[PDB]
Structure formats: C-alpha cells, structure tokens
C-alpha cells in the first residue's frame with residue numbers, strides 16, 4: 001500500500017505542481033489585466049466627466 | 058490666357074526679402090477636379106503654377122482616410138524647409154514611405170507569399186495611415202503632431218492593433234498633455250525633439266502602453282461476406 | 287430567369303426550386319417568342335400567357 | 337507562336353506538336369532580330385531563315 | 387508542489403500590490419485629465435464670453 | 436495647418452502656394468477653413484512676425 | 486479617359502489570354518487526374534476484396550471497427566486546393582465542412598481539424614479554428630506517400646496524446662465531368678457490413694490488423710485523387 | 718456628427734466604407750467573382766451586397782408600378798438596422814430578403830417567406 | 832554599343848526588358864495574383880521591383896524632400912549594380928533596401944539596417 005500511495009503522490013504532485021504554476025501565472029496575468037481594465041475604465045470615466053463639464057460650462 | 062490668369066494671380070504669393078519687409082502671402086488655391094481626373098487642363102495648369110498639391114480623393118475619403126490626401130500624388134516642393142526641425146526629423150521620409158506602402162498594398166493584395174520585410178512594411182504603413190486620420194475641426198498643435206508622428210515613424214505603434222491606433226494616439230497625447238507637458242513645452246520653445254526629451258517621450262509611451270487596453274454523410278464500411286454476425 | 291440562367295451556365299448544381307424556375311423561364315421565353323406579321327388578338331394573348 | 341505564348345509557363349502540359357511550335361517560334365523570333373546598320377544581302381537572309 | 391503553493395501565494399500578493407499601484411497611478415492620471423478638461427472648459431467659457 | 440497629413444507629408448510654408456485639388460465633397464474647404472482657424476493661437480500672440 | 490480605357494482594354498486582353506490558357510491546361514489536368522483515379526481503381530478493388538475475405542475470418546475487435554463508448558472528439562479532414570482560381574470548389578468544400586461541424590455539435594461531438602491545402606488554412610485561420618496538422622503542396626498532383634502520411638496521422642490520433650474518438654473526411658467527389666459535389670465521409674470507425682454469400686499467413690487477426698491501415702491509406706489516396714480531379 | 722449625432726454618423730460612414738470597398742473590388746468581382754477574394758473581403762462583399770440591397774425601399778409612389786404598398790422607416794430604425802448589417806448580424810439571411818422591403822420587421826417577414 | 836560600350840548597352844537593355852515585362856504583367860498581377868505567374872515570371876517580377884526601386888536615387892536637390900543628403904553613383908558602379916540585379920545577385924535582399932540609396936555600399940548598409 002505504501003508503494004502504491006508513493007506512486008500516487010509522485011503522480012499528483014507533479015501534476016498539481018505543474019497545474020498550480022500554470023494557475024499562478026494565469027491568475028497573476030488575470031488580476032493584472034483586471035487592474036489595467038479598471039484603470040482604463042476610470043480614465044474613460046474621467047474623460048467622460050471632462051467632456052460633460054466642458055459641454056455644460 | 059487662362060494659364061496667365063492663374064499665374065499672374067498665384068505668382069503674387071511670395072516670401073518677400075528682408076529688404077522689402079520680410080512679409081509673405083501663402084496661397085491655398087482650391088481646384089475642383091471632374092471625375093477624379095487630376096490630368097485635366099486647368100488642374101495641371103495650377104499644379105504647374107503652385108509649389109505642391111494636396112490631392113483629396115473621394116475614394117480615400119470614403120475608405121475612412123480623412124482629410125483624404127492621396128500621399129503619392131500629393132507633394133510639397135518646399136518640403137522640409139516648411140517644417141520645424143522636430144517635425145522634419147520625425148517625418149523626413151513619411152510621404153515616400155506611405156507612397157511605397159500604397160504601392161505595396163496594391164501589389165500585395167493577393168500575394169500569399171509575403172516576406173517578413175514586406176509584411177512589416179504593410180503593418181507600419183497601415184498604422185501610419187490610421188495615425189494620419191483626423192476628424193474635422195480638431196486641430197493639433199505642432200508639438201502634438203510631432204509626438205503623434207513620432208509614435209508611428211519610430212515604430213512605437215507596431216505593437217498596437219491597427220483599429221486601436223486612432224484611440225492610442227488620441228489618448229497618449231492627452232496623457233502627455235495632462236502629465237508630461239514638459240515634452241510639449243520643449244518641442245514648442247526649442248522647435249527640436251532633443252535626445253533627453255526623446256528618451257522621456259519613449260519612456261512615457263512605454264509606461265502608457267503598459268496601461269493601454271486594446272479592443273482585442275456517407276459511411277466507410279467493410280463487407281464481412283456473411284449474411285449475419 | 288435571366289440572371290438565374292446566367293448563373294446556371296456555370297454552377298455545378300442548384301436546388302430543385304432553382305431548376306423549376308429555370309424550366310418555367312425557358313418556357314415563358316419560348317412562349318413570348320412570336321412570328322412576324324402575326325399579331326394576336328388580346329384574348330388570344332390572354333390565353334397564351336395563361 | 338504568338339497564340340501559344342500564353343502556354344510558355346505550362347509547356348509540360350502541352351501536346352508535343354504545340355511544344356515544338358512554341359520552341360520553333362521562339363527561335364524564329366530571335367532569328368528576326370537584327371543589329372542596327374547591318375543589313376543582310378538576300379542570300380544571307382535566305383540562309384538565315386532557312 | 388509545495389514551492390508551487392508558495393509561488394501561487396507570492397503571485398497573488400504581487401498581483402494585489404501591483405493592482406494597488408496601478409489603480410493609484412490611474413486615479414492620479416484621472417485627476418490630471420479631469421483638471422485639464424476643467425481648465426479647457428474655463429478657456430472655452432472665456433472664449434465664448 | 437493643424438492637420439497631421441498636411442503638416443507631415445505636404446508641409447505648407449509661409450510664402451508657399453499649396454494647391455488643394457480634388458473632386459466634389461472631398462474635404463477641400465474643410466482643410467482651408469481648418470488652416471485659417473489654426474492661426475488663432477498665432478493671432479493672439481500680438482506679434483506681427485507670428 | 487481614353488488612356489484609362491485603352492489601358493484597361495490591354496489589361497483585360499492579357500487576362501483573357503491567361504484565363505483561356507488556364508482553362509485549356511485545366512482541361513488537360515482533368516484528363517490526367519481522371520486517368521490517375523482510374524489507375525488506383527484496381528488496387529482499391531482488390532484490397533477491398535481481400536479485406537472482406539479477412540473480415541470473414543477476422544475477430545472484428547480491432548479498434549477501427551468499434552464505436553467508442555461515448556465519443557467526445559471527432560476528427561475532420563478537409564481536403565482543399567492549394568492554389569486559387571478554382572471557383573466555388575474551396576467554398577463548397579468548407580461549406581460542407583461547416584455542415585458536418587453542425588451535425589457533430591447536434592450529436593455533441595467536438596470537431597478537430599486536419600486540413601489539406603492552403604485555401605482551407607486561410608478560411609480556418611480567419612475564423613480562428615485551430616488545425617492540428619496541415620499538409621500542402623500536392624492537392625494538384627497527389628501521390629500515395631502523402632495519402633499514407635495523412636492516413637497514418639489520422640489513425641494515430643484515432644488510437645490515442647488526446648486523440649479523437651471518430652474521424653471523418655470532407656472532400657469534393659468527382660461525380661461527373663460536369664458536376665462536382667463536396668461530400669463528407671466518416672472514415673473511422675467503420676461499420677461492418679454483412680451480405681449473403683481461403684487460407685492465411687501468419688494468422689487472420691494480425692494480417693487484418695496490419696491491412697486495415699493500408700485500407701485507410703488507399704481510401705484517403707482515392708479521396709485526394711478525386712479531390713484533385715474535382716479541383717481541375 | 719455635430720448635426721446628426723455620433724451614432725448616425727458612425728453607421729453612415731461604416732456603410733460608405735463597406736460600399737466603397739465593394740466598389741474597389743468591382744473589376745475583380747467582374748472577372749473572377751467573389752471566389753478569389755480574401756475571406757475578410759469576401760465577408761465584406763457579402764454584407765456590402767446586403768447593405769446596397771437594403772438601401773432599396775418600396776416607395777409609396779411606386780405602388781402605381783409594382784402594386785406593392787409603400788413603407789416608411791423611422792430614422793432610429795434605419796440607423797439600428799444598418800448598424801446590425803455592418804456588424805454582420807444579418808449576413809446569414811439571403812440577399813433577396815433585402816429588396817424593396819423597407820424596415821426590420823418587414824425584413825424578418827420576408828426572411829420567413831424565403 | 833558603339834558609344835557606351837557593350838557591357839553598358841547589354842545591362843541597360845536587359846533592364847528595359849525586365850521593366851517592360853513587369854509592366855505587361857502588372858495587369859495580370861493586380862487581378863489573378865502573382866502566385867499564378869510562371870516561376871521565371873515571378874523571379875522577373877521580383878527583380879523588376881528591385882530595379883525600379885534601385886533606379887530611385889537620393890539626389891542633392893531632393894535633400895529637403897527626404898532629409899538624407901545627396902549621393903553620386905559612378906557610371907561603372909551603376910553598370911555593375913544593375914548587371915548584378917539583372918542576373919539576380921540581389922534577389923535575397925528586401926526590395927525596400929533598394930529605395931533611395933544610390934550605390935552598392937549604400938545598398939549593403941540599408942540591407943543591414945533592415
């Protein structure tokens with residue numbers, strides 16, 4: 001049973017380590033791009049507010 | 058005398074010498090071509106009387122190229138002498154580059170074996186064409202123009218998708234105008250894009266590109282030769 | 287039928303509806319064909335186009 | 337030859353007679369070339385075209 | 387696998403820090419853009435007057 | 436002139452004669468009026484040389 | 486205007502010459518392709534005959550003859566031209582490929598594409614559909630080596646790598662000299678056909694297993710030859 | 718855009734762009750047809766033909782000729798329909814559905830008819 | 832050939848031959864595409880594009896049109912460069928490398944820059 005579980009762990013770790021490195025890279029990229037998207041939306045909201053204030057004034 | 062009529066007129070637009078006061082008169086004669094024929098009589102007369110052309114074509118205007126300058130036919134025989142040194146440095150070969158891009162696009166319309174250099178030229182040309190699009194009643198100061206043309210000529214737009222170039226440009230000049238106006242002030246007062254200012258502008262473009270968000274049934278069978286399985 | 291026949295001159299195949307349209311159009315063409323100096327009274331024309 | 341010239345690119349797909357015609361025509365065209373100020377007596381022309 | 391856990395946690399922490407920095411810079415640039423547009427509005431109003 | 440295409444590819448200098456030539460409704464008067472409008476920043480300088 | 490019109494006349498005359506030459510050369514290559522289609526007929530007939538004779542004595546448990554318990558991928562081979570000027574040929578082939586995709590999706594199968602010919606590469610790249618493997622440069626003049634390679638790759642994907650539970654082929658059948666129709670065939674797994682009414686070395690089962698890949702290769706070869714004929 | 722609005726202007730200029738590109742491809746279409754065009758140009762030509770045919774309308778003065786009653790498409794509906802055409806939302810319908818139809822509801826009705 | 836020499840005449844007339852053939856082919860290429868030309872014709876078209884662009888020169892009076900200074904190409908160098916182009920010794924360089932260079936040294940420099 002010990003040999004069996006050892007095989008099982010060798011299998012999972014390799015897999016889970018690979019998948020978790022991939023997931024860490026993907027999640028860092030996703031969070032960074034979400035931050036960029038929020039920044040772009042904020043800048044566009046500022047542009048819209050500026051256009052609105054110039055038009056109203 | 059129809060030629061004389063125009064020459065007698067247009068030739069009076071001149072840059073007087075310092076002995077005569079240094080004054081000047083710039084002429085922007087406007088000619089209506091019939092059926093896009095720049096090779097007619099009066100058009101060619103005026104073309105030969107003047108120091109350049111801005112051949113606005115309806116085809117390019119419809120294609121979304123506004124102000125619609127046909128780059129190849131258009132020319133300014135004064136050329137760089139009528140540009141500030143920053144603009145001359147940033148756009149010295151821009152017109153010939155765009156003419157070559159148009160020729161390549163006509164040639165490379167259905168060529169599937171494009172070389173790397175040819176495709177790079179096509180991409181740079183498309184980005185420049187987008188960069189030169191400009192809405193009406195939206196003038197740009199000369200410093201903004203040099204920064205914009207700097208984006209394309211030096212290749213900082215090569216990473217932006219074509220359809221976003223107009224936005225990228227439009228945003229960057231604002232980001233500079235709001236945050237790094239020292240570049241614009243340097244260009245305006247000095248009329249030159251100094252090495253220090255060029256480095257600052259490149260760094261600004263890169264830090265903005267970090268934050269820029271781009272818009273992007275028959276069957277095969279084997280006969281077993283027996284009546285049933 | 288004119289454009290349908292122009293298309294069918296090189297199309298490999300067409301739907302049964304297209305073939306029916308082509309067959310009807312050929313027949314209408316052969317029907318409107320008329321010999322010279324042989325005008326048809328209006329009722330005869332009505333019957334023919336019928 | 338002027339009819340076959342369109343097939344110069346695809347000579348491998350031509351009949352042997354047509355390929356021979358194209359090859360003969362190219363050499364005849366080269367034969368009819370002549371440098372300036374160097375006219376040929378009629379006997380020389382006869383041998384050349386021969 | 388363990389290192390992977392540590393690297394995932396570090397990547398999440400770095401992503402959070404970089405998101406905070408990016409949003410701070412974005413707020414600063416948005417304030418600058420709003421200031422520029424308000425000054426342009428003042429200039430336009432002066433021109434109209 | 437305030438237009439990137441003109442000020443970059445076909446620059447117009449003081450003393451030059453630049454022809455704006457084209458068919459109907461291609462942007463000619465737009466170019467010229469934009470050029471006239473772009474001189475307000477210079478007019479406000481109060482300097483005859485500008 | 487007159488200058489433009491005469492330039493256009495000269496251009497159109499040159500284009501007419503080129504297109505007429507292409508028409509005649511295509512008439513030649515139709516004959517060549519049809520002759521090569523007929524040349525492969527005896528091999529296909531006799532390999533099919535001995536394949537049926539082996540299936541009579543075979544176990545019929547070879548993977549290529551049994552549907553997977555629940556297929557989830559399906560391979561699709563789209564055979565298309567590698568040069569243009571073929572009219573709707575590529576368009577028709579890829580329209581039938583899309584129809585096959587719809588049929589697979591209705592059945593829940595996810596299609597995965599192998600493509601022969603550049604013109605299909607362009608269409609699938611434009612619509613951003615990934616192609617596992619592609620072959621180019623022989624759609625006009627296919628050779629059995631290319632058919633064998635394509636069949637080998639398809640079969641290897643079938644036995645599996647993620648692999649595919651089913652594999653089809655989409656190509657233009659040369660139904661007649663006047664008409665060519667794009668068709669879809671499920672090349673594997675094959676249905677075992679029974680109809681009413683030999684010795685073997687080294688046994689029937691190993692020989693049958695070794696021969697089925699050859700049958701796949703020869704049928705793909707026939708498909709490529711017939712697609713070349715239809716293209717011409 | 719200062720007179721008709723941003724959306725109307727954008728849709729009109731996109732339609733003009735598509736039609737001008739279709740006009741540019743006219744000689745190639747005449748000689749070789751849509752088959753030799755690039756896929757982008759092929760899609761553009763399909764929706765250009767559909768746009769050109771959708772610009773046709775059943776005029777109320779034309780009832781004396783074709784017997785078909787005339788339609789009237791409000792400006793908002795025209796803008797929306799042509800935005801959808803330029804975005805390809807209708808490029809699956811047959812070209813015939815757009816002749817002399819005048820509207821979106823009528824377009825759907827004629828699509829059902831075909 | 833009796834004045835400018837046999838080498839010069841041969842090179843010039845081969846250049847004219849290539850350019851005339853390219854001019855004739857332009858009609859075919861604009862519609863049928865270059866990929867459907869003969870291999871010899873395709874090679875000739877590439878050489879013709881390179882020759883057309885090499886005939887361009889950065890002139891002294893045109894400095895204010897291109898920014899770059901003027902250049903002078905000796906007659907022997909022109910003959911050698913165009914002879915090589917006509918025999919295809921520069922078919923590996925990109926065509927844009929031949930545009931406004933004026934000489935073989937400038938050709939090599941611009942090829943390196945690309």
Ligand SMILES: Nc1ncnc2c1ncn2[C@@H]1O[C@H](COP(=O)(O)OP(=O)(O)OP(=O)(O)O)[C@@H](O)[C@H]1O
Nearest residue numbers: 123124191192193458459460461462463464465466
């Ligand atoms: N750069 C531009 N961007 C957007 N729209 C433009 C631009 N230039 C012109 N237009 C618009 O295109 C049309 C061209 O009008 P314009 O007055 O510029 O043309 P024109 O050459 O003077 O024509 P006309 O022969 O009718 O006098 C008008 O709708 C104008 O608003």
Ligand SMILES: [Mg+2]
Nearest residue numbers: 460463464465
């Ligand atoms: Mg006007």
